[PDB]
Amino acid sequence: FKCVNSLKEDHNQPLFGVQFNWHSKEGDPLVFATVGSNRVTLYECHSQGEIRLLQSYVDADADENFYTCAWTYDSNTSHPLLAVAGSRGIIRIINPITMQCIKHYVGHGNAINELKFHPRDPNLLLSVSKDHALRLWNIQTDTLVAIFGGVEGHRDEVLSADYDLLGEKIMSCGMDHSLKLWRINSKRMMNAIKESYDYNPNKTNRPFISQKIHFPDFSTRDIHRNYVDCVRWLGDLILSKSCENAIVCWKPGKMEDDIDKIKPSESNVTILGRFDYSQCDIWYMRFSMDFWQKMLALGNQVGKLYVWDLECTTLTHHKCGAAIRQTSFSRDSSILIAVCDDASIWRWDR
Ligand SMILES: CS(=O)(=O)c1ccc(-c2cnc(NCc3cccc4c3CCO4)n3cnnc23)cc1
Ligand SMILES: [Mg+2]
Ligand SMILES: [Mg+2]
Ligand SMILES: [Mg+2]
């Protein structure tokens, strides 16, 4: 990788999120979104390292602090859509063509730390919050499908979550040092999703009733000893990190235990490997994988970018010295974008 370009957003506030739109065809514009301050900005990647500013969304609330964004598409037209959220605990769905807010969802008792769209169902949006819960939304019918949390749910702020490859299950993590598994392919969750598609408030005076999932399908506090701020699936395996200068690769149960045979009382975990690095011991630092899950990237607190081949390399620039909060690879993995605490954006080309 070579650093081909960089820019600084005029708001001068930290950028906490960056996502390339992976829902565009080959030959279509390479677009990425950044989120920082109360702003959402779209950029287009062109040849010879050129970055073109497309549009900017500025939230009506000046006190909003966007922490996360995630792309989807409208199933009927294939038109892209962008979901954003942060400190206000409000999810906003933005039309990226006009950069206008189409709709909003309220419900979480606090800030939203991460948003993820179901890998198969583009209408299924997952949010994780400081209120200790995860929420699954159906954005086609504007319904709250399920709330994951309660007694045996997270006991502190949820920082991250990820769906597995097929979207049959979710792994979540947070400030309680725990990683929790929630199956959404159960008869209960499959019926709840089916019911959310039939719901329409114009044909009934009764509200749609959300599933209250109080119990995870697996839980562990034996991987990390501090806030777990990033979790991703790698097939049936899990990649997770805390502020202990390591990304841990692990699985629930014993070495040969099938993840779909695991009982909720499973007390074993198996560590399969570790990706070690330096100076990334502050909270709220996200790692990312390319579409192919062949590369793993993580920025550190002094602007160094670590890249590992999943099938190490350190990317540095003398002008890049602020914490890299999040990175995103373009769908073809030819471009890696890093966003920083000083509102700076860095473009690395393969
Ligand atoms: C020192 S400072 O500049 O004043 C500052 C201020 C706020 C935050 C902050 C960032 N991000 C989130 N949530 C999203 C999140 C969650 C897990 C990992 C992760 C992210 C974003 C990048 O990596 N926050 C929730 N509460 N505060 C925060 C960090 C530093
Ligand atoms: Mg084996
Ligand atoms: Mg299976
Ligand atoms: Mg063990």
Curated annotation (Swiss-Prot):
Component of the PRC2/EED-EZH2 complex, which includes EED, EZH2, SUZ12, RBBP4 and RBBP7 and possibly AEBP2. The minimum components required for methyltransferase activity of the PRC2/EED-EZH2 complex are EED, EZH2 and SUZ12. Component of the PRC2/EED-EZH1 complex, which includes EED, EZH1, SUZ12, RBBP4 and AEBP2. The PRC2 complex may also interact with DNMT1, DNMT3A, DNMT3B and PHF1 via the EZH2 subunit and with SIRT1 via the SUZ12 subunit. Interacts with HDAC, HDAC2, histone H1 and YY1. May interact with ITGA4, ITGAE and ITGB7. Interacts with CDYL. Interacts with BMAL1. (Microbial infection) May interact with the MA protein of HIV-1. Residues 1-350 are annotated as: Interaction with EZH2. It comes from the Eukaryota. Polycomb group (PcG) protein. Component of the PRC2/EED-EZH2 complex, which methylates 'Lys-9' and 'Lys-27' of histone H3, leading to transcriptional repression of the affected target gene. Also recognizes 'Lys-26' trimethylated histone H1 with the effect of inhibiting PRC2 complex methyltransferase activity on nucleosomal histone H3 'Lys-27', whereas H3 'Lys-27' recognition has the opposite effect, enabling the propagation of this repressive mark. The PRC2/EED-EZH2 complex may also serve as a recruiting platform for DNA methyltransferases, thereby linking two epigenetic repression systems. This is Polycomb protein EED. The modification N6-methyllysine is found at K116, K187, K203. Its main location: nucleus. The keyword Aminoacyl-tRNA synthetase does not apply. Changing W283L: Abolishes binding to H3K27me3. The modification N6,N6,N6-trimethyllysine is found at K116, K187, K203. Residues 68-222, 220-350 are annotated as: Required for interaction with the matrix protein MA of HIV-1. Induction: Expression is induced by E2F1, E2F2 and E2F3. Changing R221S: In COGIS; decreased trimethylation of 'Lys-27' of histone H3. Changing Y284A: Abolishes binding to H3K27me3. It is found in: Nucleus; Chromosome. Expressed in brain, colon, heart, kidney, liver, lung, muscle, ovary, peripheral blood leukocytes, pancreas, placenta, prostate, spleen, small intestine, testis, thymus and uterus. Appears to be overexpressed in breast and colon cancer. The modification N6,N6-dimethyllysine is found at K116, K187, K203. Keywords: Acetylation, Chromatin regulator, Chromosome, Disease variant, Host-virus interaction, Methylation, Nucleus, Phosphoprotein, Repeat, Repressor, Transcription, Transcription regulation, WD repeat.
